């Protein structure tokens, strides 16, 4: 549409409060190694349930 | 002990050891302030008196400061009519400190 007036800067901040980037709740490590993870996906070494993935 | 005296047409409460303010006196710092215009000293109870300015009472004081306050502002204004005017005032006073008052 348009607007009435130029709005206050507290409004602009309430309007963004739910759209803000949300916490990850910590991280994963392997249940069976000291290799770092990406949670419930497969690492660069194929590690989750062994085999091999992502040979870049 | 608390007591009441008249600054003028207004009546004022004050205690012992109290520094209190009123409108400016002629009486200076190196002089004595004293009030015979005491309306009661409220003793242990309400007193039942008719004739005020109790003859068996005084509030002795002294001046402790003569100054001026902060600047207060007065705006007189009427809209769409192009009417705006301003005045200031700081107002004089005297501080007195109360030593007197019998129980």
């Amino acid at each position: 549409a348009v607007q009435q007036n130029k709005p206050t800067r507290s409004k602009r901040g309430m309007r963004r409060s739910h759209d803000a980037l949300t916490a990850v709740t910590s991280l994963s490590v392997d249940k069976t190694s000291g290799e770092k993870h990406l949670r419930h996906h497969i690492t660069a070494d194929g590690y989750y349930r062994g085999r091999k993935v992502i040979a870049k | 002990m608390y007591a009441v005296f008249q600054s003028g047409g207004k009546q004022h409460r004050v205690s012992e050891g109290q520094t209190v303010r009123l409108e400016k006196l002629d009486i200076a710092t190196g002089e004595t302030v004293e009030f015979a215009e005491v309306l009661m000293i409220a003793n242990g109870e309400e007193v039942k008196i008719g004739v005020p300015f109790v003859d068996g009472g005084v509030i002795k004081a002294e001046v402790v400061a003569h100054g001026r306050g902060e600047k207060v502002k007065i705006v007189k204004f009427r809209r769409r009519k192009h009417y705006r005017k301003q005045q200031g005032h700081r107002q004089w006073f005297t501080d007195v400190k109360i030593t007197g008052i019998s129980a």
């Binding site: - | 192009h82 705006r84 005017k85 301003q86």
Partner: protein, 48 residues
Amino acid sequence: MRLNTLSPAEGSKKAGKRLGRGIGSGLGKTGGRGHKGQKSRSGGGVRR
């Protein structure tokens, strides 16, 4: 030196209105000319 101790003759100085400056000033809007009509506006039309 005795210069810069001078002053205008007794009562000679009016100073006179500057106009068009502030709104708590007394002078401001219209100029001392009032609302609308030929004499409130800039100089034109009619002879004396």
